[PDB]
Amino acid sequence: DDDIAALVVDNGSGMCKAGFAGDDAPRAVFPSIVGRPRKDSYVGDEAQSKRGILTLKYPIEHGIVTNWDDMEKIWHHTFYNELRVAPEEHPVLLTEAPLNPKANREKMTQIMFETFNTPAMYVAIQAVLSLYASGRTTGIVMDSGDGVTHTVPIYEGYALPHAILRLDLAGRDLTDYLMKILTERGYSFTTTAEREIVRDIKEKLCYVALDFEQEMATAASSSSLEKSYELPDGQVITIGNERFRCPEALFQPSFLGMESCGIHETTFNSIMKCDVDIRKDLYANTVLSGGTTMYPGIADRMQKEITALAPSTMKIKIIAPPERKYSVWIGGSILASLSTFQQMWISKQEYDESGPSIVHRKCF
Amino acid sequence: KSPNVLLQNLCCRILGRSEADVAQQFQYAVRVIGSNFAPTVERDEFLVAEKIKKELIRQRREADAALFSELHRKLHSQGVLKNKWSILYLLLSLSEDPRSYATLFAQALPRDAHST
Amino acid sequence: LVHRILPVAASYSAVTRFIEEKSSFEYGQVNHALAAAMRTLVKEHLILVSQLEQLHRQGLLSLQKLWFYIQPAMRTMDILASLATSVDKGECLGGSTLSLLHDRSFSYTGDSQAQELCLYLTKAASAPYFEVLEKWIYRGIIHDPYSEFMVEEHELRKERIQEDYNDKYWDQRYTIVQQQIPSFLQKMADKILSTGKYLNVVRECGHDVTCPVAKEIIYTLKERAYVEQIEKAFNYASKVLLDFLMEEKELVAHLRSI
Amino acid sequence: LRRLLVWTYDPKIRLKTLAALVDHCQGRKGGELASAVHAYTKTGDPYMRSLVQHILSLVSH
Amino acid sequence: PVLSFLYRWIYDGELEDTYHEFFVASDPTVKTDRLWHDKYTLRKSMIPSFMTMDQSRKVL
Amino acid sequence: SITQLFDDLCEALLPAANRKRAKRSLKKVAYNALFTNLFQLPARNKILMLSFDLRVGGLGPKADRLEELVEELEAVGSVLDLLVQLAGSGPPRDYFLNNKHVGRNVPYSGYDCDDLSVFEMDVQSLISREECLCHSMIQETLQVMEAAPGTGLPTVGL
Amino acid sequence: IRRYTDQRSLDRSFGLVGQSFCAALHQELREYYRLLSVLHSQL
Amino acid sequence: NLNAVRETMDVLLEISRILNTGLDMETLSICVRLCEQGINPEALSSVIKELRKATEALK
């Protein structure tokens, strides 16, 4: 780097982002999968290409661990295969999704200190890393990915987990609803390759307009939302209207079949549960986050709903980044370069002398 | 304090309202206090003393006109005010009669005949 | 070295006589305002030469230093003596001088000291002229004390001059002087003559000096606002006279009677 | 200060005007005097004009 | 001054001097209903070298 | 993102001449000072106090112009709050004012002769520059003509 | 230089670009007098 | 609309010029877009003054 360098590892559920601290892009980006057939032991592009003779599991699915073997295996293939660094010469910063229990943090550092034995570590939350790129210590962050979603109030650089609203949203559920509605429309969908094609067309070809009603009426009378797509496979599927009708669960959640509230209702009831004195302060720097920036154009509609939420006699100061999927990454990238961050960094001595639970207090 | 915030404190004394509400009058005050701020004419407290006497003669009250003399002496006995002329001129200008003209009555020297 | 400096003293000595002389009533009304505008550089000049004299007593000024200091003066005060000599050589009063300055206002650009000097003198000089213009364009008759304005009034409407001895007063009653045209009003000059001509016969029966412009006529180089004001007045003058003539004492009745 | 010529330049011009009406108007009183100060509002220098425009405001009271 | 003359020659205006600083050489008493034919000759010595010939002929 | 625009601000205050790696390290001092404040009366009255600070130092129309320009600025709101904090953080006549020989309907006030004294300072300021020049050319050469030899030449020092 | 820029500055036939050329020349000659003024005092 | 937000920023430039800041045209465009995100200007006052000092150590 520019000083004694560190490691940054973003353990998510859509993808695993790894690399050394002080690099603005991740040095390696792998998808979030476990080995051991349904290669012999591999995580990466090749494991996702051979998904049909392997198993797919996420280590953190919503903020709970499904299997100790699974979490240690995905961490192990991140630290030893995705980067291949020596643990004595680089300390590691680990991450956990917002609203995660303290015992999970203890189990996390218990894996990291036993299977690799580094002399120093850090465990941080994701929202503090997202806000630290935004150069502030205060704001409301709406993270919406493909396996987690939280509207996180963060005040004084410490997210209060009592006021974070947890919302289970997953991109697997999106792809599931896409399969159900393509079968309702009438379409062969029973294998993995068309799942890859359908996730490709929802990430890249799918359109989200600023208004729901106007474009839906116009495309229902004559589809100007359709465009012909001829892949190199030689398959022809298109409809514009239905792929814009599918992610409606943001406004009305009962379209996807979800039981919990929609996204605007979620941040609306969350700001109802924010303190009245801190409301204007959190709104003075409100940020978009989450992986849904994979198709850009969703942002304008997100800002419109946040403007409709709070009053308009207050002039909104909304921080609007172009890219907001590498937020956890760029947080650690800036943070480990500063030497003020090293005073909250935990050594091996406090882990052995004062137990595991000190990583909950010294790192945050 | 500094004078610039002190004029605001005056704008908050006489008007009850907040200073974010009334700012047109504070703007009108800042023009007139500025650029005519410091003394530029000759100060003399004795003429102002005799004019406080002439105001109290205009009420036909001769007792407080003799009380003013010992108060005017006490102002010089202590001597902790930089401009004795200003506050007596000020208080004389702000008089109110419970119950004339000044083109026959001669004022102070301007230091426009004298070099600044 | 002392010979090198004498042009600036020569270009002072031929202006200060001018400033006194052309400030009297005989020398125009614009030569007045011109000689008064060459006072502002004498102010600069006087205080510089005074303070440089007081600086010299300490030994902080010398001859070479003085020569180096007075270089921008050597341009600006030379140009004014050249201007005064050109005014003296062909004697111009009023509008004719206002052509001469208009020549001077293009004869230098790249100096940028001998441009701004003339650019200030030009706006100074057409303050007396454009206040005769502020009456003649909005009213019927001149109040010119001299005869150096571009229009000159005559009388063919008199006690002893009948209506069949003057026919129409387009004959000689309103004329334009030859060289008192300011030489940039040439395109409007005929309309300038026609305007107060329209206005006086509506003052003759009514009172109408009213206009929708009523704006102070000013000068700037490469400005044509003092064109548009004249055009806007010229429209309303002929409009009011034509509308008055065909309504009261109409030609509609008289033509059918012919 | 160059024998005080900084301070006396526009003096000798104002005063020259105030010495001209005081020679031109000799023995005039009454309306024949307001026929002799109204002959000096017909100047072209604004310095004399704004001076006589003040003197004539004084006399017409 | 070179761009000063080009403001009377990309907008309305005609060159005036006896000391030429700009290529236009108008032809006196040709100004009639026919001046879209040759009336303004292109004289090379007052063409500036920050314009090429295709530019210094198009402005005419 | 915004983290790139802080480095663009880091590029602006750097003049062009390592020297792209000093930039990324000055970017850290920019971040260490951004969170010092984050760790630990409307807009328009703050204009009035500085307009006052002008008007006491004379020069009245200049305050009259600053108020007119912030008036159309009040007709983006967060940046004037930065502008009132930075004041002196950077580097440390016409003949229609005091003349009555020109104008069109020029008023009358008689002589003032207390700006004629600041018309002598109008010359003293010109003299204070052209004496500072003769102070800045005899010093820049006495600093080189006086030393041991080999102080104005780096190649003698090797 | 002083000879050329003085012969072409009494020319009203050198035109307004030559009068700009010359204006630049006069500006450079003023700085040449600046030096010889400072040198004059050290003598 | 981009002509109007240009002229207002031009008006913004001059009143920071006569108050004698060190900010120029490009630093003002950076600072205006940074304030539009929701960044506290009271801290930007500190980071610009520290950066201009640490710049002089390089020269």
**Residue G36: C-alpha distances to residues A30, C3, G29, G39 (Å):** 75, 18, 11, 5
Counting one residue from chain D and one from chain F, the pairs whose CB atoms sit within 8 A come to 24
Task: Compute the radius of gyration of chain D from its Cα atoms.
Answer: 14
Neighbour count for residue D22 (Cβ, 10 Å):
9
Question: Which positions ≥6 away from E43 have C-beta within 8 Å?
Answer: E20, E23, E24, E25
d(CA C235, CA A299): 59
**How far is Cα F6 from Cα A321, in angstroms, rounded to an integer?**
13
What is the rounded (10 degree) CA torsion for A167, A171, A175, A180? 0
What is the dihedral sign for C-alpha A13, A18, A22, A27? negative
Q: For residue A143, what are the β-bridge partners?
A: A150
Pairing relation of β-strands A92-96 and A7-11? Answer: parallel
The helix (run of H) or strand (run of E) holding residue C175 is strand C174-176
Residues 6+ apart with CB under 8 A from B32: none
Taking the CA atoms of C28, C30, C32 and C38 in sequence, report the sign of the dihedral they define.
Answer: negative
Helix (H, G, I), strand (E, B) or coil at F103: coil
Asked if C61 and C52 count as a contact pair (C-beta separation under 8 A), the reply is: yes
Q: Which residues in chain A have their CB less than 8 angstroms from residue H37's CB?
A: 134, 285, 317-320
How far is residue C67's CA from residue C2's CA, in Å, rounded to a whole number? 9
User: Do A5-126+328-364 and A169-260 agree at the fold level?
Assistant: no
CA dist D49 and D59 (Å) reads 15
Interior CA angle at A31 toward A30 and A34, to 5°? 110
- Say how far apart CA H16 and CA H10 lie, in whole Å: 10
Amino acid at A300: D
User: Of the candidates B8, E15, H31, which has an alpha carbon nearest to the alpha carbon of residue F76?
Assistant: H31
Question: Cα–Cα distances in Å, from A285 out to A151, A280, A282, A288, H39?
Answer: 14, 9, 6, 10, 7
The two tokens of residue G18 are 């030559």
For the domain spanning A127-168+262-327, the CATH number is 3.30.420.40
Radius of gyration of chain G (CA): 13
* Amino acid sitting at position B106: A
B21 touching chain F per CB within 8 A: no
CATH topology of domain A5-126+328-364: Nucleotidyltransferase; domain 5 (3.30.420)
CA B8/CA B11 separation, integer angstroms:
5
Contact predicate A35/A345, CB 8 Å: no
* Residue A142 and residue A290 in contact, taking contact as beta carbons nearer than 8 Å: yes
Q: How far is residue A76 from each of residues A9, A70, A84, A333, F40, measured CA to CA in Å?
A: 12, 10, 10, 21, 41
As given in the structure block, the two tokens for residue A16 are 């695993």
Give me the residue from F9, F13, F34 closest to H43, CB to CB. F34
Angle between helices C189-205 and C116-136 (to 10 degrees): 30
| Cα F50 from Cα F84, distance rounded (Å) | 9
- What is the rounded CA–CA span in Å between residue A58 and residue A68? 12
Distance (Å, whole) CA A187 – CA A181: 9
C-alpha–C-alpha distance, residues A221 and C17, integer Å: 92
C151-153 and C174-176 beta bridge pairing: antiparallel
* Subunits in contact with chain G (3 or more CB pairs closer than 8 Å): C, E, F
Measured in degrees and rounded to the nearest 5, phi and psi for residue A139 equal: 165, 175
Please name the residue of chain A whose CA is at the shortest distance from the CA of residue F78.
Answer: A317
Please state, in angstroms and rounded to a whole number, the distance separating the CA atoms of residues D46 and F106. Answer: 7
Q: Map tokens 């006194």 to a residue.
A: C20
User: For residue F28, how far is the Cα from the chain centroid?
Assistant: 28
Rounded to whole angstroms, the Cα distance separating D55 from F102 reads: 19
**Residues from C in contact with D at Cβ < 8 Å:** 23, 25, 28-33, 35-36, 39, 42-43, 46-47, 49-50, 53-54, 127-128, 145
- For the record, the structure tokens of C138 come out as 């909005």
Experimental method: cryo-EM
DSSP string, A211-248: -SHHHHHHHHHS-SS------SS------SHHHHHGGG
Structural domain boundaries in chain A: 5-126+328-364, 127-168+262-327, 169-260
C86's enclosing H/E stretch is helix C71-89
DSSP bridge pairs for A125: A96
d(CA B38, CA B21): 29
Kindly list the distances between the CA atom of residue F36 and the CA atoms of A3, A334, H42, in Å, as whole numbers in the listed order: 22, 16, 10
Q: Which strands, in side-by-side order, build the sheet including A15-20?
A: A28-31, A15-20, A7-11, A92-96, A120-125, A346-347
Single-letter residue type at G26 = H
Environment class of A81 (CB within 10 Å of its CB; exposed 0-12, middle 13-18, buried 19+):
middle
F 96-135 residues with CB < 8 A to B:
114, 117
**DSSP 8-state code for residue A205:** I
Min distance F82 CA to chain A CA atoms (Å): 15
CATH of domain A169-260: 3.90.640.10
Q: Residue F80, CB half-sphere, CA atoms under 13 Å: how many?
A: 22
Question: Which amino acid does the sequence have at F127?
Answer: I
Measured in degrees and rounded to the nearest 5, phi and psi for residue A167 equal -135, 125
Looking at the partner chain, which of D1, D2, D45 has a beta carbon nearest the beta carbon of C32?
Answer: D45
Give the C-alpha distances (Å, rounded to integers) separating B9 from B1, B6, B19, F41.
10, 5, 9, 12
Judged by DSSP in three states, A148 sits in coil
Do E and A share at least 3 CB pairs under 8 Å? no
Amino acid identity at D8 = T
Q: Cβ H43–F33 below 8 Å, yes or no?
A: yes
- B103 in the Ramachandran plot: left (φ > 0), alpha (ψ -120 to 50) or beta? alpha
C108: nearest CA partner in chain E: E1
Beta bridge partners of A30: A16
- Disruptive mutation site among D14, D15, D50, D52 for chain F (greatest number of F CBs within 10 Å): D50
Q: What are residue E24's DSSP bridge partners?
A: E42
